[PDB]
Design an enzyme around this catalytic site. Structure first.
Site, mmCIF file in Angstrom:
data_model
loop_
_atom_site.group_PDB
_atom_site.id
_atom_site.type_symbol
_atom_site.label_atom_id
_atom_site.label_comp_id
_atom_site.label_asym_id
_atom_site.label_seq_id
_atom_site.Cartn_x
_atom_site.Cartn_y
_atom_site.Cartn_z
ATOM 1 N N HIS A 80 0.816 -1.210 0.000
ATOM 2 C CA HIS A 80 0.000 0.000 0.000
ATOM 3 C C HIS A 80 0.857 1.270 0.000
ATOM 4 O O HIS A 80 0.298 2.369 0.032
ATOM 5 C CB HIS A 80 -1.054 -0.035 1.127
ATOM 6 C CG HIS A 80 -0.528 0.088 2.516
ATOM 7 N ND1 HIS A 80 -0.055 1.273 3.034
ATOM 8 C CD2 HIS A 80 -0.471 -0.814 3.524
ATOM 9 C CE1 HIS A 80 0.311 1.084 4.290
ATOM 10 N NE2 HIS A 80 0.064 -0.172 4.613
ATOM 11 N N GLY A 106 2.936 6.263 9.533
ATOM 12 C CA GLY A 106 4.260 6.167 8.964
ATOM 13 C C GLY A 106 5.062 4.975 9.431
ATOM 14 O O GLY A 106 6.161 4.748 8.912
ATOM 15 N N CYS A 119 4.255 1.857 9.045
ATOM 16 C CA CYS A 119 4.090 0.714 8.161
ATOM 17 C C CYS A 119 5.425 0.329 7.540
ATOM 18 O O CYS A 119 6.244 1.184 7.182
ATOM 19 C CB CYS A 119 3.058 1.025 7.082
ATOM 20 S SG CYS A 119 1.388 1.212 7.777
#
Lengths: 306, 305
Positions: A41, A143, A145
């Site tokens: 993503h 942030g 991820c």
């Protein structure tokens, strides 16, 4: 002596963290050999996440649309491919800091260390458990991820988790390093049921053994129980059923302490039925289930790595 | 979101851990530039520790009596000196992995990460607090002496602790990197009283703010209090008195959440007097005091290094 929730030393993983930017989105990636792994993503805008078609979104991207930065070093992307929910970005430089490593899919109830990162830079390390319902209760801000979870055995890093999502309930979901989610979750901003969680019984028992080893013994009692009798109590209190496999993995702790596993089960039963009466065990006022039997043996025996 | 007891990334410190051997005793040392720092009781046998004369014991040692090993590399000791309770071993090679670093003496109530080591090899990392009575509640087995505690600010490692002793009560004592013990303790295997500990009030308040930021608000209540009214309760429950300095350091959290500091105190008072009624806050059934206000701001804002 003393007993702490301890994470693995994070240096070997710090040397693998990079920043990955695609359009407006920046998150963390993991640089091993000449491949950078990151959540797919990264190619999504905020609006894309409501209902993303990842295949269609990725087709609009070329190698030069992925900015990968390792500290201040810029990596050149020479290939990209999607594997399940992870993106694999081939770069023209092998990470000189690549440790010995494996990719492993861990089982529910196992523990691992998380290196929380933002913009490719580490901020902290903590130990957590994969819940029976395949969530983790982490610390992940916007942030984070692409932050990874891992275990270390001597010189080898076993990567087991990559962070992808925070569910609306505030718990966390992610994948193994082949991009397969743990649990039923998808990388889409939608309501997602995690399902009933349970307490990791074998871990609670391990931690009771750790308590005895450190001198906390008030909970040791007169009783014993059977595996079937104990499991009737386990079910009532939403504890995982105990199996003989669990009893066997607790063997070394039973031998060190001289407390048979079913005797420790009877103590746990009394704790479940009667509570802790305002007392503590190893500094905790609740029954702790984020220590595996291996974790307890490690800490009580001083196992080291490098 | 979510709130975890988080340690600093340990890589910068891992590269400084070495093994120090003197006769029969091996512990950990910290290799920075061309100096290795370690507890001076590396020169003691088991029997020496009962009543050591460190000056006399060290005089019987020469540079070549100290074996310093970095991984598989052997370092050459070219000088040795005792500074308070630490030994400084001058080596002929500057550690190429030396980070930017400072030596700092922390205050009671402040927090730091410990890199627990054995035989010079890191085994784990955890966050803890310097207790008001200058002990720490760590996890330290035999051979962990010389393990260090530290904080990181961007690229700079501030070493604040070196582990020396486990007291007979099972809690832990050590020094700053100049070898001065925190608290009244000495490096002698003897009974040593730690004295009454107290709970770090400003840290509990910080963690309550962390809870509110993460959605735990059941403990927010109807009342307010005064600094003196609260401190009467604090003293009764063996909590550190809250001062205006503490109120000021909590200012940013008060501003973010819109909860005045004295209102949060009134919530804490009710928790102390009435307990938690079997509820939890941030997954804990007791009031947590090992998060400083800066720790909470760090974790809730994603500060990186």
């Amino acid at each position: 002596s003393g007993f702490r929730k301890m994470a693995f030393p994070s240096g070997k993983v710090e040397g693998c963290m990079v920043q990955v930017t695609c359009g407006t989105t920046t998150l963390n990636g993991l640089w091993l050999d000449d491949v950078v792994y990151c959540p797919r993503h990264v190619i999504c805008t905020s609006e894309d996440m409501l209902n993303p078609n990842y295949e269609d979104l990725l087709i609009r991207k070329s190698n030069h649309n992925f900015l990968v930065q390792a500290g201040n070093v810029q990596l050149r992307v020479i290939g990209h491919s999607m594997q399940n929910c992870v993106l694999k970005l081939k770069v023209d430089t092998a990470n000189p800091k690549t440790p010995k490593y494996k990719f492993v899919r861990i089982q529910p109830g196992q523990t691992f260390s998380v290196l929380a990162c933002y913009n490719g830079s580490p901020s902290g390390v903590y130990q957590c458990a994969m819940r029976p319902n395949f969530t983790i209760k982490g610390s992940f801000l916007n942030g984070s991820c692409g932050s990874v979870g891992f275990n270390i055995d001597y010189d080898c890093v076993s990567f087991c988790y990559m962070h992808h999502m925070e569910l609306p309930t505030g718990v966390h979901a992610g994948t193994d390093l082949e991009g397969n989610f743990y649990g039923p979750f998808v990388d889409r901003q939608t309501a997602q049921a995690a399902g009933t969680d349970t307490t990791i019984t074998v871990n609670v028992l391990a931690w009771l053994y750790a308590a005895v080893i450190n001198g906390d013994r008030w909970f040791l009692n007169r009783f014993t129980t059977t595996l079937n009798d104990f499991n009737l109590v386990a079910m009532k209190y939403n504890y995982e059923p105990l199996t003989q496999d669990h009893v066997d993995i607790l063997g070394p702790l039973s031998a060190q302490t001289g407390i048979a596993v079913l005797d420790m089960c009877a103590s746990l039963k009394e704790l479940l039925q009667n509570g802790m009466n305002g007392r503590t065990i190893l500094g905790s006022a609740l029954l702790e289930d984020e220590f595996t039997p291996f974790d307890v043996v490690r800490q009580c025996s001083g196992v080291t790595f490098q």
